[PDB]
Design a protein around this nucleic acid. Structure first.
Ligand SMILES: [Mg+2]
Ligand SMILES: [Mg+2]
Ligand SMILES: [Mg+2]
Ligand SMILES: [Mg+2]
Ligand SMILES: [Mg+2]
Ligand SMILES: [Mg+2]
Ligand SMILES: [Mg+2]
Ligand SMILES: [Mg+2]
Ligand SMILES: [Mg+2]
Ligand SMILES: [Mg+2]
Ligand SMILES: [Mg+2]
Ligand SMILES: [Mg+2]
Ligand SMILES: [Mg+2]
Ligand SMILES: [Mg+2]
Ligand SMILES: [Mg+2]
Ligand SMILES: [Mg+2]
Ligand SMILES: [Mg+2]
Ligand SMILES: [Mg+2]
Ligand SMILES: [Mg+2]
Ligand SMILES: [Mg+2]
Ligand SMILES: [Mg+2]
Ligand SMILES: [Mg+2]
Ligand SMILES: [Mg+2]
Ligand SMILES: [Mg+2]
Ligand SMILES: [Mg+2]
Ligand SMILES: [Mg+2]
Ligand SMILES: [Mg+2]
Ligand SMILES: [Mg+2]
Ligand SMILES: [Mg+2]
Ligand SMILES: [Mg+2]
Ligand SMILES: [Mg+2]
Ligand SMILES: [Mg+2]
Ligand SMILES: [Mg+2]
Ligand SMILES: [Mg+2]
Ligand SMILES: [Mg+2]
Ligand SMILES: [Mg+2]
Ligand SMILES: [Mg+2]
Ligand SMILES: [Mg+2]
Ligand SMILES: [Mg+2]
Ligand SMILES: [Mg+2]
Ligand SMILES: [Mg+2]
Ligand SMILES: [Mg+2]
Ligand SMILES: [Mg+2]
Ligand SMILES: [Mg+2]
Ligand SMILES: [Mg+2]
Ligand SMILES: [Mg+2]
Ligand SMILES: [Mg+2]
Ligand SMILES: [Mg+2]
Ligand SMILES: [Mg+2]
Ligand SMILES: [Mg+2]
Ligand SMILES: [Mg+2]
Ligand SMILES: [Mg+2]
Ligand SMILES: [Mg+2]
Ligand SMILES: [Mg+2]
Ligand SMILES: [Mg+2]
Ligand SMILES: [Mg+2]
Lengths: 121, 58, 50, 119, 203
RNA sequence: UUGACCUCAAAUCAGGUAGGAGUACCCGCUGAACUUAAGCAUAUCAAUAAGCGGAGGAAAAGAAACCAACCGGGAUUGCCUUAGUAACGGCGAGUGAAGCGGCAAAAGCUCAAAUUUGAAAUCUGGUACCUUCGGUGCCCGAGUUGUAAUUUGGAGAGGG
RNA sequence: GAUGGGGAAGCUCCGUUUCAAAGGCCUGAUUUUAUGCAGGCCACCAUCGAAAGGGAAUCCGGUUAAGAUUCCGGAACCUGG
């Protein structure tokens, strides 16, 4: 018979039960594959007269990398395609559109031994 | 249609109807036609004997 | 200039790769009416207007 | 050389995935050799081969989805027959053949009879 | 049916009973929004003879329009022209306010089609209309061949082209010698009588 | 204490729809002035340009609250013609239809207002199954403030 | 400069907290279990807006044909877990 006591002078929206999605059909019905593969992060080795001086002397393995890749996706792509640990990942956007990647390897892993192993020197 | 043919015995009228123009002429029809009419509270207890929701007359 | 956004720098790459002459094998093709590059842009005369 | 499309439909999802990894090592070794020699036309006949493997895999995945939505309503939108927007927001052939029950009695009793003038 | 009794009761608008319901409803509808959903028709006799069926899809909206003339939107009453068109305040808006009431509920509910409308109540500041709308994508309307014509795409936004009961009235589409200026369309009968037709073999 | 109704909300709840583009043609709103009147203000340009809203392959109109005054005609649209006439206009400049007749084309109709009352007979959705641009069965709901059948003025209904 | 709203035939205008039911953080409960619920609290009420305002934290030496407090060598700091 008695009503509910209200200690506050403001009526607000009551918390209701919000249901989760139980859809009748998938939105696109196909799980799309990896848009940026491990073979799509790295795309071209850079062989200039200055990039080869960083391989032999500075222990810097220079790659050309796509525009949709950060420093995270370059480090896990060298460790997967080569099994070579990476200390730092250094990126710059080239003035002609693409992105240059300076990857310095560890002291235990030499950069000249991986250069002639894959084919560019 | 049953009041005009003198076929009604007991007519119930619900006061809960918000479109009141549906129900103002029902005591007027039962007065001239000699039909005894009753006014009951709530159209909700009229839908319990008929298994509906709105059962304004019976 | 020298402290810019990516969208302004993005059009500089297209503007740099178009500042070049015709390839040497173009003029030798069958039925070509192209004699020179008429869209050569110079930074001194015609500014790109971003 | 290049791969052929009819010889890729007889392989499983594991075998087409294992073929696709080996084809990306083909670009990873020949883009290294692209800067050594001035002309390499061998890279063109393998980037169309990866476009053929990615078509057969995308064909086998969509046909696997079409066999479990077969025979029931509410199929996904890209699997639906599109054919335009304007006819999808239109009356179907069953709903346009819906004649009312009053006109149905008139069509049975008095249809459009045939007649001719000969004699 | 009892709707014949509602037909004669509605005609006595200045009666003692319809002056009480006029004042309660003009206050209730003014405290609500301009365009809001009406979950039940308040005049079940008028809507039914306009095409209301109590099923899923027929939706009643209640709409409010301002009252009065159309002031010209020129800045500070400046015309910059001939003194014939110099007037500002006394322009009187060649469409009906019943048709403007149908148009404002069309932009808010673009997935429904305006069938008809009717007056319910008014005061010195507003006019109140209950506008009936039909949902075409509902399956009871796609079936039930009494109302399958509204799904045809030539009936998109009938309130904006003048195809309703107040649209054909404001356009003035009737039969008669008085309706010679517009009988099948004013801008169509204007071009049939000023087109200089030059034939092939010219008379 | 518990079960309903009415009204109003909340949702990355179940699945459906518009919004933009084009815009020659078409349906409305809104709307000028230069020019003409040998000036100019009514008029004219013009119920036009521009602006704005909304459709289709056509749109729109459409089966009379019609035209007629006759021995009457008989939805609408298009053309020939009526006619550059009736009429409008500082009757100043200018503006200006419609009925009939000939022809192209011709196709008509249905909703409420009635008691199914000896039986909401009607419909959406969910689910299972299948000859699945759909049907049957089942379970909730919409609905008696009225969903099918019957008739809608040319008729027609209730009885014999 | 959206939204709730209020104008406007309309393109859109006003307002931005105003006649709005406008929201999210700590912890406990579980040992079929995943995150529903008991609280105790809190009503703040979009978002954009100054590479010279406010604003966490790096230095020195060496190095390139052209790069730096960004690379190298050495030595520090800050934030988050
Ligand atoms: Mg950087
Ligand atoms: Mg700078
Ligand atoms: Mg200069
Ligand atoms: Mg210049
Ligand atoms: Mg500029
Ligand atoms: Mg589409
Ligand atoms: Mg669709
Ligand atoms: Mg009267
Ligand atoms: Mg409803
Ligand atoms: Mg002026
Ligand atoms: Mg003007
Ligand atoms: Mg008032
Ligand atoms: Mg029509
Ligand atoms: Mg005229
Ligand atoms: Mg017209
Ligand atoms: Mg002419
Ligand atoms: Mg003329
Ligand atoms: Mg001719
Ligand atoms: Mg001549
Ligand atoms: Mg949802
Ligand atoms: Mg549009
Ligand atoms: Mg337009
Ligand atoms: Mg017009
Ligand atoms: Mg005008
Ligand atoms: Mg001119
Ligand atoms: Mg003049
Ligand atoms: Mg002159
Ligand atoms: Mg002059
Ligand atoms: Mg004038
Ligand atoms: Mg003139
Ligand atoms: Mg005029
Ligand atoms: Mg225009
Ligand atoms: Mg089209
Ligand atoms: Mg058509
Ligand atoms: Mg045609
Ligand atoms: Mg008729
Ligand atoms: Mg006769
Ligand atoms: Mg005729
Ligand atoms: Mg004359
Ligand atoms: Mg003149
Ligand atoms: Mg004259
Ligand atoms: Mg005129
Ligand atoms: Mg004739
Ligand atoms: Mg027909
Ligand atoms: Mg009926
Ligand atoms: Mg604003
Ligand atoms: Mg700022
Ligand atoms: Mg900011
Ligand atoms: Mg700053
Ligand atoms: Mg600063
Ligand atoms: Mg230094
Ligand atoms: Mg250098
Ligand atoms: Mg320098
Ligand atoms: Mg360092
Ligand atoms: Mg150290
Ligand atoms: Mg720490």
């Amino acid at each position: 018979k008695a009503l509910k006591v209200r200690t506050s002078a403001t009526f607000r929206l009551p918390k209701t039960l919000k249901l989760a999605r139980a859809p009748k059909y998938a939105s696109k019905a196909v799980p799309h594959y990896n848009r940026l593969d491990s073979y799509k992060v790295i795309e071209q080795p850079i062989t200039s007269e200055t990039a080869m001086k960083k391989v032999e002397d500075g222990n810097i393995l220079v790659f050309q990398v796509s525009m949709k890749a950060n420093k995270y996706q370059i480090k896990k792509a060298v460790k997967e395609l080569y099994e070579v640990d990476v200390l730092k990942v250094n990126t710059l956007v080239r003035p002609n559109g693409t992105k240059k990647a300076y990857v310095r390897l560890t002291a235990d892993y030499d950069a000249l031994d991986i250069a002639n192993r894959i084919g560019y020197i | 249609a049953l009041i005009e043919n003198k076929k009604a015995k007991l007519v119930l009228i619900a006061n809960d109807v918000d479109p009141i123009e549906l129900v103002v002429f029902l005591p007027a029809l039962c007065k001239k036609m000699g039909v005894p009419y009753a006014i009951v509270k709530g159209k909700a207890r009229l839908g319990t004997l008929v298994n509906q929701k709105t059962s304004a007359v019976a | 200039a020298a402290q810019k956004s990516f969208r302004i720098k993005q059009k500089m790459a297209k503007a740099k790769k178009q500042n070049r002459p015709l390839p040497q094998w173009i003029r030798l093709r069958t039925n070509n009416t192209i004699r020179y590059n008429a869209k050569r842009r110079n930074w001194r005369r015609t500014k790109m207007n971003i | 050389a290049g791969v052929k499309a009819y010889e890729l439909r007889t392989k499983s999802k594991e075998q087409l995935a294992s073929q696709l990894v080996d084809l990306k090592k083909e670009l990873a070794e020949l883009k290294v050799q692209k800067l050594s020699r001035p002309s390499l036309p061998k890279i063109k006949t393998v980037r169309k081969s990866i476009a053929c493997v990615l078509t057969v895999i995308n064909e086998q995945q969509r046909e696997a989805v079409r066999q479990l939505y077969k025979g029931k309503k509410y199929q996904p939108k890209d699997l639906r027959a599109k054919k335009t927007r304007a006819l999808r927001r239109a009356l179907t052939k069953f709903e346009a053949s819906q004649v009312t029950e009053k006109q149905r009695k008139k069509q049975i009793a008095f249809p459009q009879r045939k007649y001719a003038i000969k004699a | 049916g009892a709707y014949k009794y509602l037909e004669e009761l509605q005609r006595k608008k200045q009666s003692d009973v319809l002056r009480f319901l006029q004042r309660v409803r003009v206050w209730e509808y003014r405290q609500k929004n301009v365009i809001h959903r009406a979950a039940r028709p308040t005049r079940p006799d008028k809507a039914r003879r306009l095409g209301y069926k109590a099923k899923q899809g027929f939706v009643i909206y209640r709409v409010r329009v301002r009252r009065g003339n159309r002031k010209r939107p020129v800045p500070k009453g400046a015309t910059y022209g001939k003194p014939t068109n110099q007037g500002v305040n006394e322009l009187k808006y060649q469409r009906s306010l019943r048709a403007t009431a149908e148009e404002r509920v069309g932009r808010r509910a673009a997935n429904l089609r305006v069938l008809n409308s009717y007056w319910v109540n008014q005061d010195s500041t507003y006019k109140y209309f209950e506008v009936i709308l039909v949902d075409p994508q509902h399956k009871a309307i796609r079936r039930d061949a009494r109302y399958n014509w509204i799904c045809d795409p030539v009936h998109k936004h009938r309130e904006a082209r003048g195809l309703t009961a107040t649209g054909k009235k404001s356009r003035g589409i009737n039969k008669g010698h008085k309706f010679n200026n517009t009988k099948a369309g004013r801008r169509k009968t204007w071009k049939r009588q000023n087109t200089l037709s030059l034939w092939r073999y010219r008379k």
